[PDB]
Design a protein around this motif. Structure first.
Motif, PDB file in Angstrom:
ATOM      1  N   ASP A  70      -8.736  11.800   0.879  1.00 18.79           N
ATOM      2  CA  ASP A  70      -7.822  10.697   0.941  1.00 18.79           C
ATOM      3  C   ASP A  70      -8.373   9.492   0.104  1.00 18.79           C
ATOM      4  O   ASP A  70      -9.350   9.037   0.652  1.00 18.79           O
ATOM      5  CB  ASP A  70      -7.300  10.340   2.079  1.00 18.79           C
ATOM      6  N   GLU A  71      -8.121   9.443  -1.028  1.00 22.68           N
ATOM      7  CA  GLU A  71      -8.611   8.175  -1.929  1.00 22.68           C
ATOM      8  C   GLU A  71      -8.107   6.607  -1.264  1.00 22.68           C
ATOM      9  O   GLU A  71      -8.664   5.749  -1.101  1.00 22.68           O
ATOM     10  CB  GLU A  71      -8.013   8.359  -3.187  1.00 22.68           C
ATOM     11  N   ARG A  72      -6.667   6.764  -0.776  1.00 20.67           N
ATOM     12  CA  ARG A  72      -6.144   5.589  -0.377  1.00 20.67           C
ATOM     13  C   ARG A  72      -6.995   5.323   1.000  1.00 20.67           C
ATOM     14  O   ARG A  72      -7.279   4.245   1.302  1.00 20.67           O
ATOM     15  CB  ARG A  72      -4.536   5.765  -0.046  1.00 20.67           C
ATOM     16  N   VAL A  75     -10.125   3.260  -0.050  1.00 21.70           N
ATOM     17  CA  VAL A  75      -9.921   2.147  -0.846  1.00 21.70           C
ATOM     18  C   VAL A  75     -11.182   1.311  -0.233  1.00 21.70           C
ATOM     19  O   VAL A  75     -11.954   0.522  -0.992  1.00 21.70           O
ATOM     20  CB  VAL A  75      -8.795   1.456  -0.637  1.00 21.70           C
ATOM     21  N   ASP A  78     -14.181   2.001  -2.421  1.00 21.54           N
ATOM     22  CA  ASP A  78     -14.098   1.493  -3.575  1.00 21.54           C
ATOM     23  C   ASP A  78     -14.574  -0.186  -3.587  1.00 21.54           C
ATOM     24  O   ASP A  78     -15.389  -0.508  -4.134  1.00 21.54           O
ATOM     25  CB  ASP A  78     -12.682   1.411  -4.331  1.00 21.54           C
ATOM     26  N   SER A 107      -4.843  10.014  -7.716  1.00 22.71           N
ATOM     27  CA  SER A 107      -3.863   9.260  -8.153  1.00 22.71           C
ATOM     28  C   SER A 107      -4.361   8.247  -8.837  1.00 22.71           C
ATOM     29  O   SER A 107      -5.575   8.140  -9.270  1.00 22.71           O
ATOM     30  CB  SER A 107      -2.765   8.550  -6.935  1.00 22.71           C
ATOM     31  N   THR A 108      -3.780   7.053  -8.959  1.00 26.66           N
ATOM     32  CA  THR A 108      -4.250   5.870  -9.672  1.00 26.66           C
ATOM     33  C   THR A 108      -4.662   4.767  -9.005  1.00 26.66           C
ATOM     34  O   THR A 108      -5.124   3.543  -9.589  1.00 26.66           O
ATOM     35  CB  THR A 108      -3.178   5.604 -10.861  1.00 26.66           C
ATOM     36  N   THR A 109      -4.181   4.528  -7.733  1.00 33.29           N
ATOM     37  CA  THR A 109      -4.500   3.410  -6.827  1.00 33.29           C
ATOM     38  C   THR A 109      -6.034   3.038  -6.781  1.00 33.29           C
ATOM     39  O   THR A 109      -6.499   1.883  -6.873  1.00 33.29           O
ATOM     40  CB  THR A 109      -3.916   3.493  -5.518  1.00 33.29           C
ATOM     41  N   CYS A 110      -6.987   4.118  -6.761  1.00 33.83           N
ATOM     42  CA  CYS A 110      -8.246   3.862  -6.663  1.00 33.83           C
ATOM     43  C   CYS A 110      -8.698   3.603  -8.078  1.00 33.83           C
ATOM     44  O   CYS A 110      -9.949   2.842  -8.202  1.00 33.83           O
ATOM     45  CB  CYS A 110      -9.051   5.208  -6.071  1.00 33.83           C
ATOM     46  N   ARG A 111      -8.298   3.814  -9.085  1.00 33.99           N
ATOM     47  CA  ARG A 111      -8.556   3.451 -10.441  1.00 33.99           C
ATOM     48  C   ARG A 111      -9.007   2.006 -10.705  1.00 33.99           C
ATOM     49  O   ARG A 111      -9.606   1.564 -11.454  1.00 33.99           O
ATOM     50  CB  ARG A 111      -7.933   4.064 -11.489  1.00 33.99           C
ATOM     51  N   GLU A 112      -7.900   1.324 -10.057  1.00 31.33           N
ATOM     52  CA  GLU A 112      -7.971  -0.188 -10.379  1.00 31.33           C
ATOM     53  C   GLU A 112      -9.518  -0.511  -9.828  1.00 31.33           C
ATOM     54  O   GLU A 112     -10.028  -1.388 -10.894  1.00 31.33           O
ATOM     55  CB  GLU A 112      -6.994  -1.032  -9.404  1.00 31.33           C
ATOM     56  N   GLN A 113      -9.873  -0.429  -8.673  1.00 35.15           N
ATOM     57  CA  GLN A 113     -11.285  -1.211  -8.120  1.00 35.15           C
ATOM     58  C   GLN A 113     -12.536  -0.206  -8.997  1.00 35.15           C
ATOM     59  O   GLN A 113     -13.220  -1.034  -9.503  1.00 35.15           O
ATOM     60  CB  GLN A 113     -11.260  -0.685  -6.721  1.00 35.15           C
TER      61      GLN A 113
END
Length: 148
Positions: A70-72, A75, A78, A107-113
């Motif tokens: 779970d990347e979410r 977070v 990150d 997904s891409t939510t972790c990419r921001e950080q």
């Protein structure tokens, strides 16, 4: 009980000694679960933390991190990698590696950080061909692989 302690705690103090000691050892055990206390209380801890716990971070965090499919849920990891100042030797390098390594998957939510932290500290370490060393330059090249 400790989950109550941090669920209240997130809002106001992060008082290093009082809970930080507790969750230091308590939150690993329930981290053996990945739900509830890991999932939640681990996060509330590490974020409340900031500059303390960088030590148990430099090894324990790489023990977990990958653990977060779970990347979410990750977070907090990150955001945790705000140890851009500390862990300057090989640890920072190696710890940078699974960051790039987990984004070649999710997904891409972790990419921001992922990106922004690489942008601030790589862009801050970024000199025009001036270099520093032979071991941190291999870092810098890897970071080029990243941003690119």
């Amino acid at each position: 009980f400790i989950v109550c302690l941090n669920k209240v705690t997130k809002s106001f103090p992060p008082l290093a000694d009082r809970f930080m000691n507790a969750v230091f050892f308590l939150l690993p055990k329930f981290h053996g679960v990945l739900k509830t206390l890991c999932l939640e209380v681990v996060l509330c801890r590490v974020e409340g933390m900031t500059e303390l716990y960088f030590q148990l971070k430099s090894k324990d965090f790489v023990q977990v991190m990958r653990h977060r499919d779970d990347e979410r849920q990750k977070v907090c990891l990150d955001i945790i990698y705000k140890m851009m100042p500390k862990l300057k030797p090989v640890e920072l390098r190696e710890l940078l590696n699974p960051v790039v390594e987990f984004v070649s998957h999710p997904s891409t939510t972790c990419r921001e950080q992922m990106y922004n932290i690489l942008m601030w500290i790589h862009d801050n370490y970024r000199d025009p061909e001036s270099e520093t060393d032979n071991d941190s330059q291999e870092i810098f090249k890897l970071a080029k692989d990243v941003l690119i």
